[PDB]
Structure 1
């Protein structure tokens, strides 16, 4: 492939460099339209800018935490972090979010990796070996109420059991209700006067509940869960302007008030170098 062809002096009536940008086109002008060039080859394919590659590496999408401790006398397991749920999202930690929102609709399978590490902040004789249970709870399933409810039987709901310190990995097909996922949606769920705007139910990728299967030892053990997400089989439509201001909320476009100028001011003139 040639990156530049050889081109010499020109004295024409045919001027490729004068255009009318009002038309909305970006005319494909090249170095050889306005200087004299020599042949050179590309030596490159643009492999690593493919959208599959761009969205295809694992990104941290969520960090939560649960603890193993005596539940005796706990009136609210959920509240003691005896167990914890997470409604899956890709817009809570901003790194991956800005990447996805370069597109309007996106379609992909997900590969999740879940790393779990334990901490024992206060005096323990040892490090126990805990098994985590991660249950995938689709909308309409009973939700866990205690850390050892009938729910955890999970007879119809996919669940994975792995050890703290290890990693769990599985992949979920594209679960969207429509043909793609809208990280933007300029609509409502119905024509209600007060219903929420923008956040919709066609960007729901399910939800996940974590708990330790082990009963309690004498000390307490903090287990912190990190969920990583990798898109595989990516398809993206309609590019948009990149995010400039900071994010404030999952699912709305809102930016913070009295934010700071995002364009760097010159130290000098327009004329400055």
Structure 2
């Protein structure tokens, strides 16, 4: 492939460099339309800018935490982190979010990796070996109330059991209701005067519940869960302007008030180098 062809002096009536940008086109002008060039080859394919590659590496999408401790006398397991739960979503952390929102609709399979590490912040004789159990609780299915409810039987709901310190990995097909996931949605769930605006109403994915299977030892053990997400088989439509201001909320476009100028001011003139 040639990156530049050889081109010499020109004295024409045919001027490729004068255009009318009002038309909305970006005319494909090249170095050889306005200087004299020599042949050179590309030596490159643009492999690593493919959208599959761009969205295809694992990104941290969520960090939660649960603890193993005596539940005796706990009136609210959920509240004691005896078993946390996460409202699956993909905009809670921003590195990956800005990347996805370069597109309007996106379609892909997900590969999740879940790393779990334990901490024992206060005096323990040892490090126990805990097994985590993460359940998929899609919307419409009983959601766990205690850390050892009938729910955890999970007879119809996919669940994975792995050890703290290890990693769990599995992959979920594209579960969207439509043909693509909306990265943006300028609508409501119905014509209500006070219903919420955004995608929050569309990206109804349900939540995922984690717990330790082990009963309690004499000390307490903090287990912190990190969920990583990798898109595989990516398809993206309609590019948009990149995010400039900071994010404030999952699912709304809102930016913070009295934010700071995002364009760097010159130290000098327009004329400055």
Structure 2-normalised TM-score? 0.99
The alpha carbon displacement at 1:200 in A equals 3.8
Kept after mapping to 2: 8 A contact 1:19/1:27: yes
Distance 2:162 2:201 in 1: 30
Kept after mapping to 2: 8 A contact 1:69/1:82: yes
Kept after mapping to 1: 8 A contact 2:144/2:151: yes
The alpha carbon displacement at 1:136 in A equals 0.5
Distance 1:204 1:153 in 2: 24
Aligned partner of 1:115 in structure 2 is 115
Kept after mapping to 2: 8 A contact 1:188/1:200: no
The alpha carbon displacement at 1:201 in A equals 3.9
Find the residue that maps to 1:115 and give its secondary structure. strand
Write out per-residue CA displacement over residues 191-223 of structure 1, whole angstroms, 9 at most, x where no aligned residue: 000000003443233320000000000000000
Kept after mapping to 2: 8 A contact 1:185/1:200: no
Distance 1:34 1:56 in 2: 39
Find the residue that maps to 1:83 and give its secondary structure. coil
Aligned-residue Cα RMSD (Å) equals 0.6
* 1:3 corresponds to 2:3: yes
Structure 1 unaligned blocks of 5 or more: none
Kept after mapping to 2: 8 A contact 1:135/1:160: yes
Structure 2 unaligned blocks of 5 or more: none
The alpha carbon displacement at 1:47 in A equals 0.1
The alpha carbon displacement at 1:164 in A equals 0.1
Write out per-residue CA displacement over residues 60-108 of structure 1, whole angstroms, 9 at most, x where no aligned residue: 0000000000000000000000001111111010000000000000000
Distance 1:125 1:46 in 2: 55
Distance 1:86 1:58 in 2: 18
Distance 1:172 1:204 in 2: 15
Kept after mapping to 2: 8 A contact 1:183/1:203: no
Moved more, 107-116 or 202-211: 202-211
Write out per-residue CA displacement over residues 159-190 of structure 1, whole angstroms, 9 at most, x where no aligned residue: 00000000000000000000000020000000
Find the residue that maps to 2:112 and give its secondary structure. strand
Q: Give runs of aligned pairs for residues 166-177 of structure 1, distance below 5 A.
A: 166-177=166-177
Distance 1:213 1:37 in 2: 69
Write out per-residue CA displacement over residues 7-52 of structure 1, whole angstroms, 9 at most, x where no aligned residue: 0000000000000000000000000000000000000000000000
Kept after mapping to 1: 8 A contact 2:139/2:205: no
Distance 1:170 1:45 in 2: 32
Structure 1 residue runs of 4 or more that deviate by more than 4 Å after TM superposition: none
Aligned partner of 2:48 in structure 1 is 48
Number of residue-to-residue matches in the alignment: 273
* 1:22 corresponds to 2:30: no
